[PDB]
Amino acid sequence: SGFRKMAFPSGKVEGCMVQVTCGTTTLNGLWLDDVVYCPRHVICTSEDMLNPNYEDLLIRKSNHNFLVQAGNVQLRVIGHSMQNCVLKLKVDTANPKTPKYKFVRIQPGQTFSVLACYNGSPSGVYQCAMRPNFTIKGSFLNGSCGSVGFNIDYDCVSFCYMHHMELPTGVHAGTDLEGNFYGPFVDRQTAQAAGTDTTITVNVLAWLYAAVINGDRWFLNRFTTTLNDFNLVAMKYNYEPLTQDHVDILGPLSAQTGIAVLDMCASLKELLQNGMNGRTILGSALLEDEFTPFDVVRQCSGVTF
Amino acid sequence: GSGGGSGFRKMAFPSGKVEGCMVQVTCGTTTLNGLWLDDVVYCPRHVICTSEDMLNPNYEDLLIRKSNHNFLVQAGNVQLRVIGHSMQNCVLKLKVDTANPKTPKYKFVRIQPGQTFSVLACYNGSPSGVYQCAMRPNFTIKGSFLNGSCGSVGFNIDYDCVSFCYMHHMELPTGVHAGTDLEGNFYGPFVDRQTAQAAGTDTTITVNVLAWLYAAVINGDRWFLNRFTTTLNDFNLVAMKYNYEPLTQDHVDILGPLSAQTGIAVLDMCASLKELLQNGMNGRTILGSALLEDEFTPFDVVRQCSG
Numbered sequence: 077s078g079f080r081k082m083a084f085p086s087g088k089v090e091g092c093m094v095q096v097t098c099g100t101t102t103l104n105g106l107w108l109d110d111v112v113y114c115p116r117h118v119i120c121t122s123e124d125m126l127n128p129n130y131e132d133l134l135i136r137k138s139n140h141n142f143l144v145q146a147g148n149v150q151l152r153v154i155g156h157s158m159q160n161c162v163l164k165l166k167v168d169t170a171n172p173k174t175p176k177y178k179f180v181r182i183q184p185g186q187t188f189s190v191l192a193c194y195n196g197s198p199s200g201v202y203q204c205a206m207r208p209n210f211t212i213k214g215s216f217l218n219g220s221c222g223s224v225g226f227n228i229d230y231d232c233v234s235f236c237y238m239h240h241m242e243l244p245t246g247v248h249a250g251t252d253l254e255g256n257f258y259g260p261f262v263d264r265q266t267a268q269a270a271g272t273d274t275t276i277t278v279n280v281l282a283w284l285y286a287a288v289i290n291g292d293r294w295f296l297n298r299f300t301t302t303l304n305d306f307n308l309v310a311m312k313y314n315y316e317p318l319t320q321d322h323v324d325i326l327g328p329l330s331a332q333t334g335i336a337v338l339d340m341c342a343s344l345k346e347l348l349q350n351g352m353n354g355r356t357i358l359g360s361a362l363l364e365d366e367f368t369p370f371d372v373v374r375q376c377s378g379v380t381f
Numbered sequence: 382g383s384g385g386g387s388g389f390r391k392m393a394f395p396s397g398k399v400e401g402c403m404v405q406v407t408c409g410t411t412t413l414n415g416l417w418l419d420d421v422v423y424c425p426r427h428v429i430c431t432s433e434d435m436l437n438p439n440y441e442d443l444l445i446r447k448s449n450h451n452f453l454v455q456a457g458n459v460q461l462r463v464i465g466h467s468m469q470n471c472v473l474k475l476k477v478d479t480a481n482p483k484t485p486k487y488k489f490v491r492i493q494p495g496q497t498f499s500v501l502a503c504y505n506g507s508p509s510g511v512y513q514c515a516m517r518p519n520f521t522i523k524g525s526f527l528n529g530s531c532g533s534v535g536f537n538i539d540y541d542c543v544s545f546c547y548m549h550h551m552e553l554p555t556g557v558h559a560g561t562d563l564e565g566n567f568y569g570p571f572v573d574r575q576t577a578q579a580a581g582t583d584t585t586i587t588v589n590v591l592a593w594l595y596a597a598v599i600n601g602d603r604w605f606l607n608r609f610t611t612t613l614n615d616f617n618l619v620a621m622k623y624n625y626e627p628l629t630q631d632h633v634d635i636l637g638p639l640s641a642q643t644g645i646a647v648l649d650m651c652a653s654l655k656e657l658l659q660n661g662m663n664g665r666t667i668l669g670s671a672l673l674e675d676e677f678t679p680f681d682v683v684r685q686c687s688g
C-alpha cells in the first residue's frame with residue numbers, strides 16, 4: 077500500500093557528463109554535440125565568488141584557460157561565450173553519445189530526474205520536484221554544480237535544470253540550460269533565503285487519482301466546486317491555485333477513474349478543511365505533492381524510452 | 382547535503398551501465414527482459430512457460446522440450462542468435478553468437494536483508510525507470526513492477542564494477558515483490574509458480590532506522606532526541622517487542638561514522654528510538670515522514686549527506 081518515486085534511466089545523460097576546471101575550481105559540464113555547458117562561476121576564485129563581475133572575469137579568460145575533461149581525456153576548447161549564468165565552451169570534438177535533446181524551462185510543480193555528478197563522474201540519480209518557491213530538495217554536495225535535471229519523452233532528453241547553489245535551509249537552486257535562474261536567486265555568495273513554500277495542488281490531485289486507481293477511495297465525496305471557488309479556498313491552506321493547464325493535464329486520470337476534476341477538487345477541499353480523521357491514503361497520513369499527473373501514468377503504465 | 386530537514390530522498394545508482402545490458406527475450410507469447418553479459422543472456426526461466434504452464438510448472442520437463450530456436454532474443458532492433466541454453470535454478474542462460482560490447486565489469490552477489498540496491502525497471506528489453514529498494518527481513522521487496530517487468534535487475538555499483546544482486550520474477554497478493562539472485566536462487570521461501578504465496582511476518586530494519594535518525598540530525602532536526610540511556614541488550618528487548626530486528630555490535634560499529642559526525646553516541650540514538658517506539662511520534666514528522674523510515678542504510682545516509 078504505497079506509491080514510490082521513479083527516476084528516468086540516466087544512461088543518455090551519463091554519456092554527456094564532463095568536468096570543467098579553471099584554476100583549482102572544478103565542476104561538471106554537459107557535453108552535447110561540440111559544446112560544453114556549465115555554470116559560469118567555474119571562472120571564479122573562492123574570493124571572486126563573494127562579489128563577482130562576471131563580464132570582467134570572463135574578459136581575462138582565453139580558450140586555453142579552460143580544462144575540459146571526459147574522464148581524464150582532455151577536450152580542447154576552441155571558443156567560449158557566456159549566456160546568462162551559463163558558460164558555453166565550444167570543443168573540437170562532437171560527443172558521439174549525444175542523445176536527441178531539447179532545452180526546456182519547467183513550471184513549479186513539475187518533476188524531473190537529477191543525475192548528481194562529481195568531477196564529471198555520475199554518482200546517483202533521484203526524482204525531485206521544482207517547488208513553488210523555485211527550490212528543489214535532494215542531495216548535492218561540494219563539486220556537484222553543473223549536474224543536470226531532465227525528463228525523457230520517448231527517445232528525446234529534455235534538459236530543464238543545471239545546479240548552482242545551496243541555500244541556508246539545505247535546499248538547492250539552479251538555472252535552466254539557457255542560464256536563467258529559477259527563482260530570484262543569483263550566483264554569488266550572498267545572503268539568500270528560500271521564500272515561503274506552498275503545496276503543489278495539481279500533484280496532490282494526481283496522487284488522489286492514483287489512490288482511486290488502486291482502490292483507495294474513501295475520500296471521494298458527493299460535492300463539486302468551481303475552479304475559482306476552489307482556488308480561493310486552496311490558497312487559505314497554503315496550496316497553489318490551479319491553472320487551466322492543470323485541469324487539462326489531469327484529464328487522462330479523470331477519464332480513467334470517471335471522477336471529474338472539479339469533483340476531485342471538492343474532495344481535496346474537504347480533506348483540507350476536515351483533515352484525515354486518522355486515516356491514510358496509499359499508506360500515507362500526509363498528502364503527497366511530488367508526483368505529477370504524468371508521473372502517475374508513467375508509473376502505472378510502464379512507459380519506456 | 383541531502384536537501385534539508387523537510388525530506389530525505391531515495392537515491393539510486395546511475396543506470397547506464399545496466400541499460401547497455403538489457404535485451405528482450407520471447408518464447409511463444411511470453412516476453413520478458415534478459416541481461417546480456419559477454420555472450421550470455423540471463424533471464425527468468427518462466428519465459429518458457431505458456432500462461433497456462435505458469436499455474437504449475439515442471440521446469441525440467443518444459444525446458445527439455447525447448448530448442449535454441451524457440452528463444453527470440455532482441456537487442457534493440459537486432460536479433461541475437463541463440464546457440465546454447467542451460468538452466469541454473471530459476472534462471473535461464475542463453476548463449477548467443479555475439480558478445481555484448483557494453484558489458485561492464487561486474488559480479489554476481491547475494492545481498493543480506495536490510496541492504497539496499499537500485500532497480501532498473503524494464504519492459505520489452507527497454508529501460509523504463511530507476512529506483513532504490515531494500516531487501517526486507519522477510520525477503521520481499523517493495524518495488525514497482527508491472528506485467529513484462531520480469532528479468533529487470535537490481536544492482537549496486539562500486540568504482541566501475543556492477544554487482545548484480547536481484548532479478549525480478551513475481552508479485553505476491555499483498556503487492557510486494559519476490560525474485561532471485563543471479564544464480565537463480567529465490568530470496569525467501571517463494572517459488573516461481575503462479576500460486577498465491579504469503580511472506581513471513583515482516584520486521585523493521587533497526588540499523589537503517591537509526592541511520593535515518595542520524596540523517597535527520599545532520600539536516601538540523603533533533604526534536605526526537607532525549608537523554609535516557611540504554612544498554613544494547615535493553616534496547617534490543619524493546620526493539621524485539623515492537624517487531625524490530627535486533628541491533629548487533631557489528632551494526633553499532635557501522636554506525637560509528639554517523640555517531641562521530643553528529644556527536645550522538647549510538648546507544649543514545651537507541652534511547653531516542655526506544656522512546657519513539659513506546660510513545661509514537663504524536664503527529665510530528667521526521668525528514669517529512671510520519672513513519673520511521675527503514676530503507677536507508679548507514680552507507681546510503683553518508684553517501685547523500687557528506688560523500
Ligand SMILES: *[C@H](O)[C@H](C[C@@H]1CCNC1=O)NC(=O)[C@H](CC(C)C)NC(=O)OCc1ccccc1
Nearest residue numbers: 427435526527528529530531550551552573574
Ligand atoms: C513477470 O514479468 C511478472 C511480473 C509481475 C507481474 C505483475 N507485477 C509483477 O511484478 N511476473 C509473473 O508473471 C509471475 C510468473 C510466475 C510464473 C512466477 N506471476 C505473478 O507474478 O502472478 C501475480 C500477478 C499479479 C498481477 C498481475 C499479474 C500477475
Ligand code: NA
Nearest residue numbers: 384385386387
Ligand atoms: Na528540506
